[PDB]
A paper describes a structure:
Microbial epoxide hydrolases, cis-epoxysuccinate hydrolases (CESHs), have been utilized for commercial production of enantiomerically pure L(+)- and D(−)-tartaric acids for decades. All these three CESH[L]s exhibit high sequence identity (>60%) with L-2-haloacid dehalogenases, which are members of the haloacid dehalogenase (HAD)-like superfamily. Studies have shown that both RhCESH[L] and KlCESH[L] adopt a two-step catalytic reaction mechanism by 18O-labeling studies.
After crystal screening and optimization, crystal structures of RhCESH[L] and KlCESH[L] were successfully resolved at 1.94 Å and 2.02 Å, respectively. Two molecules are present in a crystal asymmetric unit, and gel filtration experiments showed that both enzymes form homodimers in solution. In RhCESH[L], the key residues involved in hydrophilic interactions include R124, R145, Q150, and D152, while L128, F137, V141, L159, and L176 participate in hydrophobic interactions. However, sulfate ions, from the crystallizing solutions, were observed in the catalytic pockets of RhCESH[L] after the co-crystallization with CES. The residues involved in sulfate ion binding, including D18N, Q20, T133, N134, K164, and Y192 from the core domain, as well as R55 and R59 from the cap domain, formed a polar substrate binding pocket that was well-suited for binding small, highly hydrophilic molecules. Activity assays revealed a decrease in RhCESH[L] activity with increasing sulfate ion concentration, indicating that sulfate ions can compete for the binding site during catalysis. However, the binding of non-catalytic ligands, including sulfate ions and products L-TA, did not cause significant structural changes.
Author numbering:
A (entry chain A), B (entry chain B): 11 to 247
Write the structure that this text describes.
Amino acid sequence: QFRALLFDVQGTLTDFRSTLIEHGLSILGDRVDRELWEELVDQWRGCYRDELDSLVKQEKWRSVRAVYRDSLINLLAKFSDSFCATSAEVELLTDGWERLRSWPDVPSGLEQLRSKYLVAALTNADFSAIVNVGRSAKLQWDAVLSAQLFGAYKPHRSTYEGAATLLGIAPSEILMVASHAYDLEAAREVGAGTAYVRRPLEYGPTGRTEDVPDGRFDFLVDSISELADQLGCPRLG
Amino acid sequence: QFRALLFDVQGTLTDFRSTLIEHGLSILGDRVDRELWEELVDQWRGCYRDELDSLVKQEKWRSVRAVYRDSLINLLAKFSDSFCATSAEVELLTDGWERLRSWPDVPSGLEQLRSKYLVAALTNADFSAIVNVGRSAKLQWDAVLSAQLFGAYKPHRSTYEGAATLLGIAPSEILMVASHAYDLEAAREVGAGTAYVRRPLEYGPTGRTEDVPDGRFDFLVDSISELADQLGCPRLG
């Protein structure tokens, strides 16, 4: 049925929240309290989402590193009374988004899938960032794809379709894999299969994630290994 | 000194000649003699080269799969007194260029290199072709880059510079690895380092060799593992 599996990375395969909390607290130390920082991280992601949403609607693309950097700068102003940072520290903090760690099932799951399928990333993050995340999150791919290559972010159709063209396959031959429903709904619009991965801790132990019922998407799993098992991929030794 | 290595793939890492000889004989069987099929493969590589040379001069890009397919159709007409092939066999033979096997040093050389460097493919072949060749040749990349992403073949500057900016890396921090002098001299012009890999059997025992003496390029080696050793990579037991 499918020839390739295309993956969202931030959240779906990576624990961004934990990564940035600890990264930040290591750059900043006692200048900041964990609870303020965690709240900042939560707002930083929100800012990212809002800016991308605006950009998508305006049919524009910009460096995601810049999006992240500029949102941190704005947030630092909001929180100026509590702590401060240098421009050099801004660059270091922003780097955390390129040092994402993976959820425990990811490396092995992805490897299991490769017995039967090509695996590729389709990310909104810039090409350089995904290459970097490969090392921090231990992801091995057949291909790496980014919005930067198409000049458009997901959910735009061009992304998914462009990936297909690049991979020499029809969109119907792609299974999109994501823990964000908007991504899967846009993939289904171009004919792809959809696989939702539940990440209950994506937004922290007290966070609220999307509740997805059985039947909305083709697959509904709690780990990439589980998805590989449901697609009939043999197990690793 | 370097953050990443960018590699030519066909010939540099892959024994395309042996691949397409055994692949064609596997498909055509006894309908063609081995020595005739070998001469066809050499002319087929020659047609690809002349065609790309022509397109580079015209600032044009076209699918490399269609380049191999059309030139094979032409060669079949010239050899049509001797053997024949169906339209389905044309497509199966052309697939040979997406099933390239690697030289024996290559899979473990690439692995040793990854301990200190990012490694990426920069190929004239279509994106899907290099993705398929990763399975047949056993190549694992941090990134795969193709002339198809840039609309231009190597040696155009825009391919190396495009690779550099997508990776977010200064060209002076990229080492280009190739067994073809034209490729390394082109990379040198954009500021990259150069590593020449001698492949005495690329065009078979009686082939057109360009001799490179020492000092023409930054590195001159006989295997990717030797290159890894010269870059100070630990050997992996």
